[PDB]
């Protein structure tokens, strides 16, 4: 519309209306030029490719992309508290995206001094992939999402993708994608971009912890009419075989007949927070639970949703079972355990097996006069009819959605890092600076803009008849040098700890 | 009656490569359990999972179920010199009678790069190969993976074990078997079934 | 555990009539409800007599919602997770109901 007229306003807030929440976030972004406007084949052998499990092949593109797929993008810490203390469930409904106040700059290096000025005739290209024809990289829990704190200015990440490989070489089936082969809206400094999205129907994430356990669902005052086998012998001696039977009742609750059993397990190695307790050997990769695909071993991370530890065992944690977040200012490589935040899903213990324990025992033979009864441990157990389980919890720092891979079949598609699985998730939003030739010679150029995303969330209210008060998320009462979830003296925003969604309770 | 379209395509991506190769994850993994050298060097070191190490990254979805087949080479000098067609076969027992597992759950016939091996009862023989599905499905002749068998401690080293068969887990995806062959099958009339698509390929139907 | 209302004494003047033990001061509070057993003579001689009945009360409360723009999380009233012999605000083994601590109403914050 014009060079001197703003193309949009700043919208950040939350509107709590009945059973719905509407969150709006606006950020300032900066997009560089990636790969000098080139598509470049990338693989492992360029970086040396020493390991076959790490072997890859693919392409890096000049395009960038916008990622809002973490929860602290849309929620302040207070809005997250307001959510998790009062509500049994939530889920996204509508999405509204806007890109505006575009500014393109040109950079000139004359001797040592750089100089930056406006280039008013330059364009930025942006499109969304709403037919899902590009490789979808948003469900991989990558960095580069909108910053949690609204005053931070962030850099747009570079888009890239992987295709089939054998070693570092390609195969005939590998695909190459030119993102220029997609129609894209072009924008000068007066244009803006917007689109709206409708989330497909998903179940409400359960932000509650059960107040009962799967094996205690019985009435403690009443016997069952079922019987169990109490004694196979009358006493010590020879030829003492017998069959005795007893009523299953309040006194022995382990043997009662039950309608439902805990969910599946894939056992994890158990690591202790106190270092001396752990074995003196390198078992981080060697003792790890993995899965193999086409001859490449991938770590099982985080894997099936399982309780992190038994009741009363806070120190132990599954080796790859939990999501581990970095604290603000944490290094990249070989940081100490006090630099990271290890989330623990102990609230799902009621319906789910412990991650570091066997699922149970089975009989391994036929007993007889000459053979004792033998059992063996179930290290992994797939789905059985009659199982019930809870999914993994979502965190303020964690992912929101994933894309359900397009396949013949799936079971319980809910993604394993947490969040809402979708066949048609929010589409990818690709962006680049249009090359301006000074043809391998170009004007050094970058752009900057404001991006605002609005999401409508549906709430499931807490109906409970519980008499006594709930557990709630609360801030610490006592004095401290800094306020949690605020800036420090240098102006750095930090998130002190991971915050889960499960506080309120339900009956099982 | 209404049935799902048979898939007649091969995935161009593998289930473990779905990531953006240029960007780190915000998730950490446990890189080192020992500082180095000898006695009393225990630590916990963590690193960002990223492009340099793609094996340890967190993933939302895992490959489908497996029931292992014995591997048989088309070169006869490679195969063991003994009769293992029945003895070394994967089977399922019903009412005391053993049925060979044929063709079985849909799995990749062989790893990439080995075309001379095939599952003993894994592939239909008119010898077809399922290698197209190696992207989302485990290899028929391989273990599904590893699990821990113990609690490690200062006394006990960490022990793993091979998963020979794996049932359905939440978050699995898989491809069905390809059609060449039969077209449809009748779904047995039962209280329950899972993913009724028939194992020799084609369209399962209650009618 | 505290009181709800008080009756503002009937006087020429008062200042900030809000009652000092807490709660809502009112010139016409909820009225007193008096009850007795009618004497049945067997006159100082009567039949020894008592009554028992169900009583139900219902109050409608109006709420003022929290509008705050505070970024960081509030202090909240919460139960403690750690294990204990009894549940707080529940019965014990003999069936006695207890209220473990006095709970005030001031947790959320405002600007002055």
């Amino acid at each position: 519309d014009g060079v001197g007229s703003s193309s949009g306003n700043w919208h950040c807030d939350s509107q709590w209306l009945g059973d719905r929440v509407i969150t709006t976030s606006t950020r300032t972004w900066a997009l560089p030029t990636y790969n000098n406007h080139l598509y470049k084949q990338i693989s492992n052998s360029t970086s040396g490719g020493s390991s076959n499990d790490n072997a890859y092949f693919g392409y890096s593109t000049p395009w960038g992309y916008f990622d809002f797929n973490r929860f602290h993008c849309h929620f302040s810490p207070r809005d997250w508290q307001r959510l998790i203390n009062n509500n049994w469930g939530f889920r996204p409904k509508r999405l509204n995206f806007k890109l505006f106040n575009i500014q393109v700059k040109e950079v000139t290096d004359n001797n040592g001094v750089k100089t930056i000025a406006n280039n008013l005739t330059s364009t930025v290209q942006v499109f969304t992939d709403s037919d899902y024809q590009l490789p979808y990289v948003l469900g991989s829990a990558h960095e580069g999402c909108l910053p949690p704190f609204p005053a931070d200015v962030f850099m747009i990440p570079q888009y890239g993708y992987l295709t089939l490989n054998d070693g570092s070489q390609a195969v005939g089936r590998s695909s190459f994608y030119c993102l220029e082969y997609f129609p894209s809206q072009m924008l000068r400094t007066g244009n803006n971009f917007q689109f709206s999205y409708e989330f497909e129907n998903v179940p409400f994430h359960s932000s509650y912890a059960h107040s009962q356990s799967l094996d205690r669902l019985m009435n403690p005052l009443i016997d069952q009419y079922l019987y169990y086998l109490s004694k196979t012998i009358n006493g010590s001696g020879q030829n003492q075989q017998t069959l005795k039977f007893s009523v299953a009742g309040p006194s022995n609750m382990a043997v009662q007949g039950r309608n439902y059993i805990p969910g599946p397990s894939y056992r994890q190695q158990r690591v202790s927070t106190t270092v001396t307790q752990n074995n003196n050997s390198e078992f981080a990769w060697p003792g790890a639970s993995s899965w193999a695909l086409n001859g490449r071993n991938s770590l099982m991370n985080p894997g099936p949703a399982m309780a992190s530890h038994k009741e009363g065992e806070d120190r132990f944690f599954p080796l790859s079972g939990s999501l581990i977040f970095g604290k603000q200012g944490t290094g990249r490589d070989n940081v100490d355990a006090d630099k990271v935040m290890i989330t623990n899903e102990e609230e799902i213990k009621t319906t789910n097996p412990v991650a570091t324990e066997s699922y149970g025992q089975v009989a391994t033979n036929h007993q007889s006069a000459q053979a004792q009864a033998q059992t063996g441990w179930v290290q992994n157990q797939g789905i059985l009819p009659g199982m019930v389980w809870q999914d993994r919890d979502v965190y303020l720092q964690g992912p929101i959605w994933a894309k359900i891979p397009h396949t013949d079949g799936n079971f319980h598609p809910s993604p394993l890092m947490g969040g809402f699985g979708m066949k048609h998730p929010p589409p990818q939003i690709l962006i680049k600076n249009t090359p301006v030739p000074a043809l391998n010679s170009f004007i050094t150029q970058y752009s900057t803009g404001q991006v605002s995303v609005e999401i409508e969330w549906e709430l499931q209210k807490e109906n409970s008849k519980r008499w006594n008060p709930e557990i709630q998320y609360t801030s610490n009462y006592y004095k401290s040098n800094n306020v949690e979830f605020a800036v420090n003296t240098e102006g750095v925003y930090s998130e002190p700890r991971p915050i889960g969604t499960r506080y309120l309770t339900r009956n099982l | 009656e209404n049935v799902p379209f048979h898939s007649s395509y091969a995935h161009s991506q593998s289930l473990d490569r779905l990531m953006n190769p240029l960007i780190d994850q915000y998730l950490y993994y446990l890189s080192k359990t020992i500082n180095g050298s000898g006695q009393n060097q225990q630590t916990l070191k963590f690193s960002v999972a990223g492009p340099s190490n793609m094996a340890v990254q967190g993933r939302n979805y895992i490959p489908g179920p497996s029931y292992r087949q014995q591997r048989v080479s088309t070169t006869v000098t490679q195969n063991n010199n003994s009769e293992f067609a029945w003895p070394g076969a994967s089977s399922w027992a019903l009412n005391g009678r053993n049925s060979l597992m044929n063709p079985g759950p849909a799995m990749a016939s062989h790893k990439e790069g080995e075309d001379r091996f095939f599952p003993l009862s894994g592939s239909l023989i008119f010898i077809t190969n399922e290698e197209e599905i190696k992207t989302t499905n485990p290899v028929a002749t391989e273990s599904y993976g590893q699990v821990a068998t113990n609690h490690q401690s200062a006394q006990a080293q960490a022990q793993t074990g091979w998963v020979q068969n794996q049932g359905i887990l939440p978050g699995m995806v898989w491809q069905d078997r390809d059609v060449y062959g039969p077209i449809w099958a009748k779904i047995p009339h039962t209280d329950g079934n899972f993913h009724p698509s028939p194992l020799m390929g084609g369209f399962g139907m209650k009618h | 555990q505290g009181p709800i209302w008080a009756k503002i004494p009937h006087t020429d003047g008062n200042f900030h009539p809000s009652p000092l033990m807490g709660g809502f001061g009112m010139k016409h509070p909820p009225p007193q409800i008096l009850i007795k057993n009618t004497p049945v003579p067997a006159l100082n001689s009567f039949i020894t007599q008592y009554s028992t009945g169900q009583v139900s009360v219902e109050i409608e409360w109006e709420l003022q919602k929290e509008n705050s723009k505070r970024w960081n999380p509030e202090i909240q009233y919460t139960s403690n997770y750690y294990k204990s012999n009894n549940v707080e605000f529940a019965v014990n083994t003999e069936g006695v109901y207890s209220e473990p601590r006095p709970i005030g109403t001031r947790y959320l914050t405002r600007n002055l």
Partner: antibody
Amino acid sequence: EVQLVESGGGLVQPGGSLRLSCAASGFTFSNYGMNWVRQAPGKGLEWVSYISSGGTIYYADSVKGRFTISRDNAKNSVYLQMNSLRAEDTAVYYCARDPAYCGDDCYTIPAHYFDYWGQGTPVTVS
Amino acid sequence: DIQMTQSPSSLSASVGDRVTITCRTSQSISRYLNWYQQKPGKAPKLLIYAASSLQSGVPSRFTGSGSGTDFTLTISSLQPEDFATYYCQQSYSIPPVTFGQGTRVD
């Protein structure tokens, strides 16, 4: 500020039993692990027992099987129940806080160093 | 149980002097060494934690260095206030935490 004040102590006959309490103020007590250490008269510092926020419990070897540690978070107190007291148990027992605390949703990495202590109580076995 | 020995069991010094206390451990405890001072009759106070760090609210003169088996506590610009017994403890092998015998400053 953060304060630890422990009670109990005083004379007890060998083979006797004593219960030390430590009342905490100035911090959220349920978030932190608590320690008992003791100093024998004319002797060095020695660690006795530990209890974490989630109830991990350690004892020293010399003391194991006899003392038992527990905490009551409603009273903001940690307790040391000392049974089968011996003449080597004569000391000044201290209550010491472990500073490590991450939060409800993540594991805490125990520091096992004590920032705040009590004034101590004497225990004399004779 | 890791054994710890502070080398100068007793130390005599005057105000302003540079004092240095070291302890050695039988087996490596990595960087986990903590220093306490105790005045007679008082409870000890944490000075230095994690070998080289410093506790909040304690004078800048105190310093610490070391790794593995050797750690040193160095008081600089000694004053009237800090004549005390000093203790070194390791938070590495747990249980149980071990303490040094103690060093007196005169």
